[PDB]
């Protein structure tokens, strides 16, 4: 999450929008799933 919240040096917003590096949210993959406010709202995918 450091790549998404606290923008590190050397990383631009273009590198964070490629569909292979962008953050995945639960509404994108599970639009019909209701998550309590304040809980995890992102899908922590396993990238190979």
């Amino acid at each position: 999450p450091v790549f998404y919240s606290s923008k590190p040096s050397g990383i631009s917003n273009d590198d964070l929008s490629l569909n292979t590096t962008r953050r995945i949210y639960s509404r994108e993959l599970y639009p019909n799933t209701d998550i309590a406010q304040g809980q995890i709202q992102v899908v922590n995918t396993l990238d190979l």
């Binding site: 919240s5 953050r23 949210y25 406010q37 995890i40």
Partner: protein, 367 residues
């Protein structure tokens, strides 16, 4: 059932934190002035009878399952003059200390985490006229309800909100059988920028902006018996999420959700009035109501009945509430119980909310 509930962050700001108001069906915008009158209507803090007061309130969650999961509130008001008052409250919903263990060794340092959610607000209330007063409150809300794991960040999410309240209390007017008193109040709460739990500007949730309008009348008998009947109407100032579709199949839903989430809070407050296929007849459904009657004997015994009803299509939290209050010398003890009447399991069932307030300082006369 519930069709298209409003998805707003930090929902615990909309939960009653004091026993007195919770026994009145979660209404305090038009009731008599009290120390707990910060979450509901700070504008009547200038109408308080005592110089200053402090209060601690407790609301347990899942009483049958386990303790330490509760919402507490600490409020402190102080009026320097007869026209102005400074108040400050702190609400804290917490699951208690939770140990993290991944080993069975008795000698193993265990990390203790307390996923919590608190809101600290301070309000200034100024009595403009002899019977009318205004109040401005600033609130900081922090949420740390998640636990830090691998690939999961438990960084707390913070936000600010502004509350504008107004309270009117007419003088004691005599009638044929009693000398009652009229009260009215309005309060716009949670006006601030979106709170982002993921710390991303693209994924941000609206603050639970609320609008409460209430009015009440007090019948006074024998100079030592009071019966205050009050009614409050509550409406959220957040646009309704799109339902079936308001333009393939999932493309319309995705576009509608993207359009809904790409709305500023300033614009969203004005967009709250409408944004639905239904007209004013269906728009009236968005307003929940609460009707309460409080009986006061010798200003030391209080018996409160309340009925709070939300729409069946959103929220769907309809219940009755009983409450009792006792003042011995300077300490008021309030206990409230809730009888649910909705098809959904209310998490406040079988819960006896408690409140304990100490009032001290000089006494100010009430007009």
């Amino acid at each position: 059932d519930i069709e298209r509930p409003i998805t707003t962050g930090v929902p615990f700001l909309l939960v009653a934190a004091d026993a007195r108001a919770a026994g009145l069906g979660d209404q305090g915008v038009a009731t008599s002035s009290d120390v707990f009158s910060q979450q509901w209507n700070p504008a009547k803090y200038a109408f308080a009878e005592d110089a200053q007061g402090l209060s601690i309130s407790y609301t347990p969650y899942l009483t049958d399952l386990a303790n330490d999961i509760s919402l507490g509130q600490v409020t402190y008001y102080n009026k320097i003059n007869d026209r102005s008052a400074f108040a400050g409250s702190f609400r804290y919903f917490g699951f208690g200390g939770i140990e993290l263990r991944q080993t069975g060794d008795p000698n193993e340092p265990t990390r203790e985490v307390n996923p919590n959610e608190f809101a600290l607000d301070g309000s200034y209330s100024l009595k403009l006229s002899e019977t009318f007063s205004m109040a401005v409150a600033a609130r900081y809300i922090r949420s740390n309800l998640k636990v830090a794991t691998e690939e999961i960040d438990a960084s707390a999410a913070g936000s600010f909100a502004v509350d504008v309240a107004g309270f009117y209390q007419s003088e004691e007017i005599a009638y044929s059988d009693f000398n009652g008193r009229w009260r009215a109040g309005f309060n716009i709460q949670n006006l601030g920028p979106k709170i982002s739990y993921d710390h991303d500007d693209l994924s941000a949730n609206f603050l639970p902006a609320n609008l409460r309008v209430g009015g009440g009348f007090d019948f006074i008998f024998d100079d030592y018996n009071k019966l205050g009947v009050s009614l409050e109407l509550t409406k959220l100032l957040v646009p309704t999420p799109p339902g079936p579709g308001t333009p393939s199949q999932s493309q319309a839903d995705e576009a509608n959700y993207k359009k809904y989430k790409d709305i500023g809070w300033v614009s969203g407050i004005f967009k709250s009035f409408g944004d639905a296929p239904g007209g004013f007849s269906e728009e009236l459904k968005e307003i929940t109501y609460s009707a309460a009657a409080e009986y006061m004997y010798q200003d030391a015994f209080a018996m409160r009945l309340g009925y709070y009803h939300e729409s069946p299509m959103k929220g769907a939290k309809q219940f009755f509430s009983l409450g009792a209050g006792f003042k011995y010398s300077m300490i008021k003890v309030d206990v409230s119980y809730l009888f649910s009447a909705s098809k959904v399991k209310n998490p406040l069932e079988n819960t006896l909310r408690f409140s304990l307030t100490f009032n001290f300082g000089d006494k100010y006369e009430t007009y």
